[PDB]
Write a protein that binds this ligand. Structure first.
Ligand code: NAG
Ligand code: NAG
Ligand code: DAO
Ligand code: DAO
Ligand code: XXH
Lengths: 269, 269
């Protein structure tokens, strides 16, 4: 149901997205190897992959993550960590929209993700721009799990159109805004967003559509279970804004399904 | 390598061991279907498996676990839970021996394991004996992961030879006493001990030999990685009291390898 090439990208950035939580690097100086505990990111470890800049509780949203250089795959990766306690985050999660005309017209986004991004935007844009300069033929990719996925998606919508494509790989991302934003993210040029979901994961089901939220299209829906390995045959491309029959089903959702994207994510053994 | 049937059994009791942590259980009446969160025990959920008796923080070493009846596989399974925080448990692990001629003359066992068991033995024996009476044809299996693994090993050594075989499946168990106790465990009839380990799991390397501990033989050693699925070829039967070249090898050990026996164990998504 997806190409092998796409399945391979999806797996790689699930692991860069997992590395934002695991593998020690609290102040790991720039240029050190990227490694993780608990076999959370072996495809990353296998590449010639190094930190460019690490951030932590940065700005008003306490945004955390890193920027890496990957000489093997020829990538510049900005990876956002989701929340250190997701069940809590999930309970404290406010549904307020705020206008975001700076990015698009009639577009409202989630207030916390938008503001969190906006507060670190200038420093991070500058860091990506520097790498884009030193490695003009490398692909710029923003990725993240959970909250990290929301942020990556917002950051992507916000920095595209400056002359380098930015591809976004999000895992288990919540909804980030209103229907007009969904649309903007479905069609925006200057890169592709790959919005990946798993089974009846709860987070992509929040904030609810009944608070004004919509999802961009398409969705890449992983139907294999929690703790099950994923093959290219377990992923279905679902087409349409707020399409139903992928993750957006009226059944009961689940938290552990959120922590299994290709492998363990959003928690470290 | 190991047979398909034996593999199945290994997988199954890894799940009955995982269910002691992740059961939606306890304060749950006898006769209830056994189920787990986070796809922790799907092979148990497919079986017609029900609680016989649940225990929580029982006796002197706060023992936790369940006694189960399984009409599909024809089992009576006593599953002991390991610690709620394995890391602190490992850190505060005391290495004192106490004599247990009760179980076998010349035998010394870890003092906290033998006393936690000793303090709940009489109750749990009567619970097992009762179930054996109601289902004389069913096979008695004790199992456990980690400290739970220890308790199942001790309880088995203590309760065998009263008429009914007791098999024991242990996952990531610590050493439970001196040579002689090890030797008893290697030869004792009235049941078999399948003592399963994974890669460089920390827990089976404690207590260290140096403090007067030995491991019973044989050893079933999983060499597939952490978060990697296990096949029959990844399991190596290793013979010899304190044999080296399975888990007992001279390298740095790992906590995450402790938490991956056939799937996630010792923690709940
Ligand atoms: C970092 O990785 C490179 C190649 O991927 C390797 O040659 C180098 O030894 C690594 N550095 C350390 C400290 O392991
Ligand atoms: C318990 O499982 C049995 C068979 O394994 C099933 O028939 C019954 O519906 C279950 N009870 C509940 C409450 O699901
Ligand atoms: C983009 C990085 C976001 C990381 C913020 C995580 C904040 C730690 C969360 C602890 C409490 C909570 O949010 O549930
Ligand atoms: C519930 C978390 C910790 C549970 C451990 C209780 C009994 C552990 C046995 C070890 C006795 C000792 O050596 O300290
Ligand atoms: O599912 C196969 C299977 C094989 C043996 C056992 N057992 O002996 O309990 C259980 C399950």
């Amino acid at each position: 149901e997806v190409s092998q090439d796409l399945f391979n990208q999806f797996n790689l950035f699930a692991q860069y997205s997992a590395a934002a939580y695991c593998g020690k690097n609290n102040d790991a100086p720039a240029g050190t190897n990227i490694t993780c505990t608990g076999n959370a990111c072996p495809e990353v470890e296998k590449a010639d992959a190094t930190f460019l800049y690490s951030f932590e509780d940065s700005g008003v949203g306490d945004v955390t993550g890193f920027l890496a250089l990957d000489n093997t795959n020829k990538l510049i990766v900005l990876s956002f960590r989701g929340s250190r306690s997701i069940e809590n985050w999930i309970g404290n999660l406010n549904f307020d929209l705020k206008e975001i005309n700076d990015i698009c017209s009639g577009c409202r986004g989630h207030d916390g993700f938008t503001s969190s991004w906006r507060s670190v935007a200038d420093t991070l844009r500058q860091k990506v721009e520097d790498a884009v300069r030193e490695h003009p033929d490398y692909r710029v990719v923003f990725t993240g799990h959970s909250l990290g996925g929301a942020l990556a998606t917002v950051a992507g919508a916000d920095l595209r159109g400056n002359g380098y494509d930015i591809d976004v790989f999000s895992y288990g991302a919540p909804r980030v805004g209103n229907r007009a934003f969904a649309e903007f993210l479905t069609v925006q040029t200057g890169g592709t967003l790959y919005r990946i979901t798993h089974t009846n994961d709860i987070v992509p089901r929040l904030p609810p559509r009944e608070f004004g939220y919509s999802h961009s299209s398409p969705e890449y829906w992983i139907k294999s279970g929690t703790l099950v390995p994923v093959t290219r045959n377990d992923i279905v491309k679902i087409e349409g804004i707020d399409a139903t029959g992928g993750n957006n089903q009226p059944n009961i959702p689940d938290i552990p399904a959120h922590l299994w994207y290709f492998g363990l994510i959003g928690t470290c053994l």
